[PDB]
């Protein structure tokens, strides 16, 4: 099952870390929906990671590849940065025309490695 947003989302656009594109509702129209990427994906040792935090913050190059996943380069891995790539497939999902990233992990608190 899973989510995969791209499954009845199309056009899907992405600037920094806002993904917009026209998902189908119920109604079986496109509905124009948006998401804050930097809100649900997070950047561990410098990849992104499911489900996170503020990756954007540290994170650049922000793109989405087949409309499915998401790629970027985040520092963490050592003080550096390194370019990654993150299935959002099972980060995000289409409900009914509706931004609704259902994470499939997302345990603990600050799985981001994040002690402060």
């Known amino acids: 099952m899973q989510c995969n947003f791209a499954n009845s ?3 899907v ?5 806002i993904l917009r594109g026209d998902c189908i509702n119920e109604d ?3 509905h124009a929906t948006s998401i804050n990427l930097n809100y ?3 950047n561990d040792n410098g990849r992104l990671e499911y489900p996170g935090e503020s990756f954007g913050s540290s994170c650049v190059k922000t793109a989405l590849n087949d409309g499915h996943t998401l790629t970027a380069s985040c520092k963490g891995a050592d ?3 390194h370019d990654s790539s993150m299935d959002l497939n099972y980060v995000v999902g289409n409900s009914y025309g ?3 990233p259902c994470r499939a992990s997302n345990a603990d608190h600050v799985l981001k490695s994040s002690s402060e």
């Open 9 to 11: 989302c199309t056009g």
């Open 40 to 42: 649900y994906i997070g």
């Open 98 to 100: 509706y931004m609704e």
């Open 28 to 30: 079986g129209h496109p």
């Open 13 to 17: 656009e992405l600037y920094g870390y």
């Open 79 to 81: 003080g550096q940065y």
